[PDB]
Design a protein around this nucleic acid. Sequence first.
DNA 1: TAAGGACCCAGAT
DNA 2: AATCTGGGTCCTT
Lengths: 25, 81
Amino acid sequence: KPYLCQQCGAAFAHNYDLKNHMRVH
Amino acid sequence: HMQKCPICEKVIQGAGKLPRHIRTHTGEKPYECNICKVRFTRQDKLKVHMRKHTGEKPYLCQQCGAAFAHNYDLKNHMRVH
DNA sequence: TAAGGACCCAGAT
DNA sequence: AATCTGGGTCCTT
Ligand SMILES: [Zn+2]
Ligand SMILES: [Zn+2]
Ligand SMILES: [Zn+2]
Ligand SMILES: [Zn+2]
């Protein structure tokens, strides 16, 4: 929820789940 | 450069500095002192805390070499100079 | 090159 | 009075 990707806007509950998604783009 | 906190909308400066601000809201303390088990929100706060166990004193007086753990102790010391 | 790591500091406990 | 909180900037791959 509070960790929001600034490229695709997907929301992630923890910081690692946000940084896990940074490799998608 | 900077980002708005999605909880309180405050602008937080610094690439990579939002998570530490968010933890002021969540109370998450991911960093733990290996010795006394005390936990901290921030890696840099843990690092200063470990000086209590290691006795390290990185603040050095260039005049006499007196060594301190905190910069304000060093500041206090430099009056004698 | 993000962002980790380091350190400073104004205000608060 | 000393030490802490939270937010700032610089450096280094
Ligand atoms: Zn994304
Ligand atoms: Zn906030
Ligand atoms: Zn400790
Ligand atoms: Zn001295």
